[PDB]
Design a protein around this ligand. Structure first.
Ligand SMILES: OC[C@@]1(O)OC[C@@H](O)[C@@H](O)[C@@H]1O
Ligand SMILES: OC[C@@]1(O)OC[C@@H](O)[C@@H](O)[C@@H]1O
Length: 90
């Protein structure tokens, strides 16, 4: 019924990313210290989770988008979103 969210953050500002699964689609809202805005992530999914990590000054984000029993990993590594290698046999 209600939307389903996942959130991650990094640094001291901080930067925050909030992913919302709604009606089969996952979108992204972003905060970098100035106000909330809509991010570049939009992919199919009924469920979302996220994790992120820093390597020095580089942020790496992994978003896990699921529809049915299939989970697709999406990867941010500084140069746009790319499909990750994650697989599972659910
Ligand atoms: O604009 C900020 C942005 O580039 O930050 C990294 C990712 O969260 C992207 O989806 C997002 O658009
Ligand atoms: O750089 C992308 C990648 O290798 O990062 C680590 C894991 O998230 C993998 O599934 C993914 O393909």
């Amino acid at each position: 019924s209600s939307v389903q969210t996942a959130a991650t953050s990094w640094g001291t500002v901080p930067s925050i990313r909030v992913y919302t699964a709604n009606n089969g689609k996952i979108t992204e809202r972003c905060w970098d210290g100035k106000g909330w805005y809509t991010g570049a992530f939009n992919e199919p999914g009924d469920n979302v989770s996220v994790t992120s990590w820093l390597v020095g000054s580089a942020i790496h984000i992994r978003v896990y988008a699921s529809t049915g029993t299939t989970t697709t990993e999406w990867c941010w590594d500084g140069n746009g979103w790319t499909k990750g290698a994650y697989t599972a046999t659910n």
